[PDB]
Each structure stands twice: as C-alpha cells, then as structure tokens.
Amino acid sequence: MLTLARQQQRQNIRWLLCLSVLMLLALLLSLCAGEQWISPGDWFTPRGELFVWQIRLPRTLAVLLVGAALAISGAVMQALFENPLAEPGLLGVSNGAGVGLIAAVLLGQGQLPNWALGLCAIAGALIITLILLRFARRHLSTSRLLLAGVALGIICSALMTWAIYFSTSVDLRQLMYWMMGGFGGVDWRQSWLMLALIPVLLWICCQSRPMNMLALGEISARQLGLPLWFWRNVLVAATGWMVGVSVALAGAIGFIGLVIPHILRLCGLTDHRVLLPGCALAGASALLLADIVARLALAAAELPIGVVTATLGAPVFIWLLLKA
Amino acid sequence: MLTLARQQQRQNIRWLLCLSVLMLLALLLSLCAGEQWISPGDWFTPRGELFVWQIRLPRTLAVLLVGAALAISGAVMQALFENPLAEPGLLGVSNGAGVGLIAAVLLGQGQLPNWALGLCAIAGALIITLILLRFARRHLSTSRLLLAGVALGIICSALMTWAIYFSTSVDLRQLMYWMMGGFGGVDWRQSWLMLALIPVLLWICCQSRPMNMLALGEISARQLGLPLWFWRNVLVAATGWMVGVSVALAGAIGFIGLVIPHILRLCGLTDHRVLLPGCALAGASALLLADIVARLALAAAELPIGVVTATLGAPVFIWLLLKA
Amino acid sequence: SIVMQLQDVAESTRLGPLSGEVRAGEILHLVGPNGAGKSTLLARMAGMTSGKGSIQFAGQPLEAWSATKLALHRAYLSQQQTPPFATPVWHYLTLHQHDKTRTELLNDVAGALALDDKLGRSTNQLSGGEWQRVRLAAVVLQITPQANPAGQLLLLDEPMNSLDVAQQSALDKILSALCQQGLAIVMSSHDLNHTLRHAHRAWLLKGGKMLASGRREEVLTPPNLAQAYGM
Amino acid sequence: SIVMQLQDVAESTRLGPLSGEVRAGEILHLVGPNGAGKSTLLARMAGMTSGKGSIQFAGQPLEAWSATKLALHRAYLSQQQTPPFATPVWHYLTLHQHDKTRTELLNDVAGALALDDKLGRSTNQLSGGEWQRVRLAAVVLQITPQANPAGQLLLLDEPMNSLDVAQQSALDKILSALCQQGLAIVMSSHDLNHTLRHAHRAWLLKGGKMLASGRREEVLTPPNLAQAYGM
C-alpha cells in the first residue's frame, strides 16, 4: 500500500474515533438536558422512566438518524450531481417530501399512519431528486442544478402554503415548525420511521467504491467500467428514502447536508469509505447539539431546529468558502 | 453602421415601445382596481379623490419605481459579478437593507422619518453588496458569490428574527409582510422615498457604456481602458441606493431582478443602451401586475407581493433555464 | 494484429461514413481540421457513444462488450474533464489501477510525468499542464501492459493539451514504450511535424469523412493536406 | 524603433529579474517551459499587473500612462477569458473598435478568421476554436494601424490555443500584415519550429529568468534549449 495512503487512512481512523466519541458525548448530553437537567444516575428514578425513556430517548434517537441521514444525503447528492453545493435543503428535495407529506395529511387526516406517511414523503423526495437529475443530464452545470433546485423549492413551498390556507385546517405553528424543521413531537409511535432509516443508512454507508468512481466524473467513471445509470438511479432512491423519511420525521431541516460533508473533507476525509461513516457521525452529533440548543435557548417556546442549523450553518459555510 | 446592428436596434426600439405601452396599460389598470372599480370617468368622484388619488395613485407609483429599480439592480449586479444569477434578493442585499432598517428603527425611535430610515436601508444594502464584491474579487466564481449571497441572506434573517423577538414590539404580520414584501401601507407620506429613486434610476439607465465594457470581463474591460475600480464601486453604491430604498418602501421583494433582466435578453435586448431602459419598463409593469394580483387575489387580506413574485418567478425561471 | 475494426461508422453529419483498422503495437493519429469529426470518432471507438456504424473490438463488437471488461482492454481520455474537487492526485491515480497492489509502478509513471512531488496534492488544486499529466498518468496506469495483461487499446483525444515541448517529449517516451509492449495507441494528432515524426499510421478526416489512411508519410502529402485544410 | 523597454522586471520567484527591448515592426516570442514566467511577464508589459521593475512604453513609463490612452497604443490578450454570456459576436468586436465607424474593416477581419458567418451569434454559444478567433479578431480590430493611428503594441498570451494548422496560418498572415504596418507584436511562442519560422526576436525564459535573447535563430540553439527544457 502507498505511503501517503496508509498515513491518510491512519488520520482518518483517528477522526472516525474522535467523531465516534463526540456523538456519544452528545447522545448523553441530549438525554440529560430537556427543560430541567438530569443525571445518568438520577435517571433510574420514577422520573427518568417518564422523560428519559418515553420522551427524551425517542427524540434523541430520531435526531441521530435524521442527522446522520441529511449529512450523508448531501454527501450522496454532491457525488451524483458532481457538485459540492448539492444538498437536500437547497435543491428542494426536502420540500419535495413536504408536498408529498401534506398531500397525505389532507387526503386522509389522522387515518393514515406515520409509516403510511413516510412513504408519501419518500415519494415527494424521489420526484424532485429525479426532476433535478433529469435537468442534470441534459445540461450538466453547477449553476443550472443550483438554480432549478432553488426554484423547485419555491414551487413546492407554494403548493404547500396554498393547500393549507384552502383547507383552513391550518395552525400557524404547525406550518412554521414544519417549514423550519423540528423534533418537538417525536414519540415512540414513530419508531417505525426511525427503524426505516437504519437499513439504507447502513447500506449506502458501505457503497464507497461506486462513489469514489462516480466522483471522478461521468466519462472517467464510465470508461472505467462503472454501471453509471444503475448507481445514479440507485442513489437517487437511497436519497429520496432518507430525505423523505427525515422530513416525515422532523420536517424540513437544512444546512447540515451542505456543511458537514465539506468540513470532513477539510479534516482529510475524502475516500468515501471514510466520508460516509464520518458523515453519519458528524451528521448525528451536529444535529443533536442543534436540537439541544433549539430545546433550551427560549423557555417559552422550542426553537425550530431549522433556524438553529441555519443560523450556525450560513456562517460556518461562509468560512468554508474562504478556506477551500 | 453595421447591418445586423441597425437591425437589432430596430427590433429593440420596437420592444421599448411595446414595453413602454404595457406599463401605462398596467399603470391604468392599477389605478382602476381594488375590490371595487373606478373607471377613469368616475375618478373625480368623492370616491376617486380618496382611493384613486389619496391611496391608489401613490401605491402604484411606488410599485413602478421599486419594480424598475429591483429589475435594473438585477441587471447591474449581474454585470458587476459577471454572473446572471446575481440579484438583490438571492445575494441577500435585500436582507442587508432589511437588517439596516430594523436596526435604525429599534436603536432609533418611532419618530425616525422615512427618509432617515431609507438612508439606513441603503446602508444595510451597501454593507452586504460591499462584502459580496470583496468575496467577488479575491475568488471570482459564480458558485462562490451565489453561495455567499444566499448565506449572508440567511444570516441577515437571523439577526432580524432574533432582534424582533427580544423587543417583543413584534406583530407576526408586520414581520411576514416585510420578509415577503408588500405595498400595503404605502401613502404619500413616503413620497420623499419615491423621489429619491428617480435620480439614480435615470442616471444609471444612461450608464450603458461602462457596462457593455464591464460585461466583456475584467481584463478585457481593463485592457480596453475602462476605469474598473471606479465603475465597480460606483455601481455598488447605485445598487445599494436603489435596493435599500426599495426595501424601505416595500420590504424584501424577490425574483424580478433575476427574471426580468434575462427575459429581455431573450427577446434580444442585450446592449445595455436598451437592456437598462427595457428593464425599468419591464420591471415596473411586471411588479405592478404582481401587486394588483397581490391585493385583489383574496378579500381576507393582501397577499405578500413576494409570495406572488416568487410564485410566478420560480416557474418563469425554470423555463428560462431550459431555453437559454 | 488488428485489434479494432471500424465498419461504416458515422453519426449525423459531423461524422460521415468511415471505416478503418486499428493495428496493435501501432500509433494511429487522427489528423484533420476543427469539426472534422476526430473527437466524435474517438468517443465511439471508446464506447462512450452509440450509433450508425459497426465497431468490433478484438473479435466481439463493442456493443457486445461489458463495461467492466472493456475497461480492462482499453482506456479513454476525453478532450477535457473537470478535475474532481477534493481528491488527492495519488488517490485519483490509484482508482484507475486494476491492481492497487502495483504501488511502485504508480510512483514510476507519476515520476516520468513529473508528478512524484505532486502526489498527495488535491487534483482541484493543480495547474493546467499539471492536471493534464495527472490525467494521462491515471490513464496509462490503467492500461500499462506491465500491470494489466488485458491492456490492448489506448484512446487519447488531444493529449498534448497544456504540455510544453518537454512534457510532450516526456509522454512520447511513455507512448512509444507502450506500443513497443504491444499496445494500440489511437490519438488525435495536433502537430503535423509531430505526427510525421512519431505516428505510425494516420487517418486524415475532413468535414467528417476520411480523405485518406495508411502510413503517416503517405497520408500527410501536400495534395491531401491541401484537400483537408485548404492551403 | 524601440517601443517598449523592460528594466529589471520581476515579481516574486515566478518572474526573476529580467530586462529587454521591444522593437516596433517586429515579432518577439516568449519561449520557455511551463512556469518560466511567460504569462506573468506579458501581464506586466500590458499594464494589468504592477510591481518590482521598470517598464517604459514609448517614452513615458507604463505607470505614467492613463488606462484610456494605453488602450489606444496597445492591446492585450490573456491566456484565457470566459466569454460574456448573451452578447453577439458582432457587438463583442465592435466594442473593441476605437472608431465604430470603420464597419467594413470589422467584416474583413472577421472574414480573415472565418467569422463572417459567425457574427450575430452570441459569444457564449461558440466552440473552442471559434471563441479564440473571435477574441483575436476583437483584439486586432482594436489595434490595427489601418483604423487606429496610435496602435503600436499587440501583446498575445498563447494565441494559437484551439486553432488548427489552418486557423493558425490564418492568424500568421494577420500578424505579419500587422508588423509590416509597423506594429510591435509580443506573444508567448508555443511551437519552436513555429517561432523559428515566424518570429523575429525571441526571449528564452526559464525558471523565471532570461537565459537568452536576440534573433530567434541565435536564441533557439541546442545549448540554450537544453539549458531551458533539459533535453
């Protein structure tokens, strides 16, 4: 094995270690602070069974998964569209699931189960991710894709807002918490969605080869014997899956799919054999904090996870622009 | 004079004519609709003198100016950054004037006359526009600028939301209407702002030479003897001016500075000696319509200009992408 | 000896009906003006494009080949490709190797094209001439008979792009060394004196059709060159 | 006769201390490997960059010249420039003319470089070789002694880029015709045989320093070429 290679791999394992830690260190912290603090020991008390197990844990688990997803998603999209600015939130694949999600809530309010909803979101994502990819093949451009995406996002936001006002079964809050993401109402009764995230999450996190290739660029990727169409479509699915579910789980959270991936490349995680796992870990932790903060900062009302991730996002992104 | 040239000029003059007409038609229509009708005849009626003159007219003139401005601004920024995606809204120059306004208001007093505020808006815009250009020089890239801009946009949204909540002098409405633009409270008591727009609008509309050059590209522009730095900063100011006032007058309106400019290029208007004037006209009419629809759409309330502009904007933008 | 065969190949007016032979251990130069079809042709022979005509590669026809195997018997180099953002030159090259094992060979090729000090540096951070050599390198490592037994054809579209006289001479040695090992090298010639001096055979397309073929010394004659360029 | 003078020019290590003369009615070729400073040098002589050294253009030193006037006495062509989106070739060219009047001349130059049928087409919609010719054209129209009396110097950084043997020969005629009218043409040579065949004088930079100068036939000698490229 090449020298520079072995070394890089070492430092990579180093990060996958530190990151592996920070997440737990965050998983712990999430379970202890909600409104009132708690302690690992003061957990096994009548109170813990309530909060810590029936409230907190569920939520903290959803965050991890959604976080590790959105993070990976962005990674994946960037690979597909051969573009760093590729991410769920910006290109509008999130609002894609939005539309699809609401579509269900309106055609069968309260009748359709969460899992039944998840599928409707996964559809919302797939569509957009597809429409986007179509525009990606016919006119490969970082501007084009980044344009269309923003646009579709708007279109979807319109379809959503317009369909809510019409039915009047609107709640200025529900609408905002969704458009601006939030883990407020995450209960074990959504655990089916949570689980539904693990399969793909674990799978896609192992398909590094296809993406390193893919990353070289269409032609190179092809002439090297890569089943391009397959993997392109495959990831499109794996994307819509994770994305949609995440939306059904916590609405539209944005700006972690963009930043987390790049930051990890900065640390030297480039081989997708590392960037994926690295993304999962940095994705999870990253969103936990975001959630915890969204959870304490204003005692009167829980902050829309979205605002948080966005507030910290825009800045850490600007910096990334100057550094890269 | 070259053949193709004279010919293009002919078709140009034609559009400037057609656009010149469409606007008046729009100006008329606006002065005639508002939940009731008041034909030109019934204008000097105790009603007309109220609506038509003391309410409608002012509002309409505001729209025209803001439109033509936001439109021209888009052209101008695009030239400066050598990038079609350059626009007030996307790059967050509007949110810049947003922050600059709210700040002037709070840290100021409800007695701050409009003119005072407008100046603070212009400041808000200038800052952002200056920062963007800084990022535009050190790393000339269509993605960078489009990234930064969006980011600064977000950052400015935070500062705004975070400052309004703190004071509590908030009104869920006032906020949304500003963030999503609207000419709901436009009276003659803001006619000082409107005027303020006329100077620059005219001046800038005549500065075509500097931009056709500029459009060639930095080096070419320079090696051709163009006083680059001057014109760059000069236009940066012109932009801040227009945009800032526009935000003060009607808040953050978006998607006329990107679309309008391009659509006219599509029609053949490319030489700035035409594109600027054309932009003004197309920008005015365009926003007028949006506004009319914005108010007449629903009787309950007046739809945020932005919602309309962005609703029709995204679609016409997607198409423009496939066409170009 | 003949590795590839072109039978009435042509897609639209850019590439008119064209046929010819690609003989192993030889260097063929696609000579002609701009628009003369050269790139389109190469894209076919590679397998990147499909259409009207018939191309058979070492027995079986391209269309019959599976992507995977094809990549072991031939390498393709497009006229230009955007360097992958955030990817170290050494990884770029490795990925192209069918046997990651042969690490030393990588160092050799990288060296030959002045890139030993460039390894480990992200591709998105190289200069013009640099990236090119990095690409060529990557392609060579992929099909060198030394490391890959199935290597038979190396298609290059405008390789000398960005290289200086030296870097050119550098690659010349590599290519020679390659056909000497029995490789079939087909590339779009840039300089006539070059093609005369280094090529073996040479098709002379024009408008999209083949005005000539055969030994470069016969094909590059004033009558033809004039018929092709118009001077 | 001497139009431009370089006195100990050099900015950082890329361009070491270098001095020389630019004689009117002559074609000077900047010869050397990649990194040898060529582009950086040209950028100076143009006026795009400032720094350590002294360059005087036709009497007054560059630094003394006003942008406006400078643009009448010399034209610059960067190695590469992104075509302006939505702008018809004919407008592009016109903008470069100091006398929009001389419309026929535009048609001539556009013709010479095969662009008469390309006028009216948006620059952002041209091919590689096309855009280049469009650029060259634009630059020539700007400084042709025919339309512009103040034209004295034409700096070109890698002009033949994307051109085929023909399009090259095409520009050769234009450049010759230009120096014959008394223009000073300084461009970064790409092919040695070319520079030998068409250049007059020729500086041979290396590493950033000038290994030689003078008549191209004297400067392009094996000892020097080897000293410069290493072969």
Swiss-Prot record, chains A, B:
- Periplasmic side of membrane: 36-56, 108-113, 167-190, 250-257, 297-304
Task: List residues in topological domain: Cytoplasmic.
Answer: 1-10, 82-92, 139-141, 207-228, 268-274
The record, for Gene3D superfamilies, names: ABC transporter involved in vitamin B12 uptake, BtuC
Q: What is its main location?
A: membrane
Query: Where does the chain cross the membrane?
Result: 11-35, 57-81, 93-107, 114-138, 142-166, 191-206, 229-249, 258-267, 275-296, 305-324
Instruction: List the keywords (alphabetical).
Output: Cell inner membrane, Cell membrane, Membrane, Transmembrane, Transmembrane helix, Transport
User: Which CDD domains does the entry link to?
Assistant: TM_ABC_iron-siderophores_like
The places in or outside the cell where this protein is found are: Cell inner membrane
The Gene Ontology biological process annotation of the record reads: cobalamin transport
Q: Which Pfam families match?
A: FecCD
List, alphabetically, the SUPFAM superfamilies matched: ABC transporter involved in vitamin B12 uptake, BtuC
Drop me one GO molecular function for this one.
transmembrane transporter activity
Q: Which GO terms describe its cellular component?
A: ATP-binding cassette (ABC) transporter complex; BtuCD complex; cobalamin transport complex; membrane; plasma membrane
Name the membrane topology term: Multi-pass membrane protein
Q: What does this protein do?
A: Part of the ABC transporter complex BtuCDF involved in vitamin B12 import. Involved in the translocation of the substrate across the membrane.
Family stated for the protein in its record? Belongs to the binding-protein-dependent transport system permease family. FecCD subfamily.
Q: How does it assemble?
A: The complex is composed of two ATP-binding proteins (BtuD), two transmembrane proteins (BtuC) and a solute-binding protein (BtuF).
Q: What is this protein called?
A: Vitamin B12 import system permease protein BtuC
The record lists the organism as Escherichia coli (strain K12)
Curated annotation (Swiss-Prot), chains C, D:
Instruction: List membrane-spanning regions.
Output: none
Residues reported to bind ATP: 32-39
Bilayer topology annotation: Peripheral membrane protein
Matching Pfam families, A to Z?
A: ABC_tran (PF00005)
The UniProt keywords, alphabetically, are: ATP-binding, Cell inner membrane, Cell membrane, Membrane, Nucleotide-binding, Translocase, Transport
Please indicate which superkingdom the organism of origin belongs to. Bacteria
CDD domains reported in the protein's UniProt record: ABC_Iron-Siderophores_B12_Hemin
By its UniProt entry, which PROSITE patterns does this protein fall under? ABC_TRANSPORTER_1, ABC_TRANSPORTER_2
Enumerate the spans annotated as ABC transporter domain. 1-231
Q: Which reaction does it catalyse?
A: an R-cob(III)alamin(out) + ATP + H2O = an R-cob(III)alamin(in) + ADP + phosphate + H(+)
Question: Where in the cell does this protein reside?
Answer: Cell inner membrane
Question: Which InterPro entries would you find in this protein's record?
Answer: AAA+_ATPase, ABC_transporter-like_ATP-bd, ABC_transporter-like_CS, ABC_transptr_BtuD, Metal_Ion_Import_ABC, P-loop_NTPase
Q: Does the keyword Translocase apply?
A: yes
Q: What Gene3D superfamilies does the record tag this protein with? A: P-loop containing nucleotide triphosphate hydrolases
Gene Ontology molecular function: any one: ATPase-coupled transmembrane transporter activity
**Record SMART domains:** AAA
Q: Which GO terms describe its cellular component?
A: ATP-binding cassette (ABC) transporter complex; BtuCD complex; cobalamin transport complex; extrinsic component of membrane; membrane
Q: Is Translocase tagged as a keyword?
A: yes
Family indicated by similarity: Belongs to the ABC transporter superfamily. Vitamin B12 importer (TC 3.A.1.13.1) family.
Looking up NCBIfam families in the UniProt record yields: PRK03695.1
Q: How does it assemble?
A: The complex is composed of two ATP-binding proteins (BtuD), two transmembrane proteins (BtuC) and a solute-binding protein (BtuF).
| The protein's name in its UniProt record | Vitamin B12 import ATP-binding protein BtuD
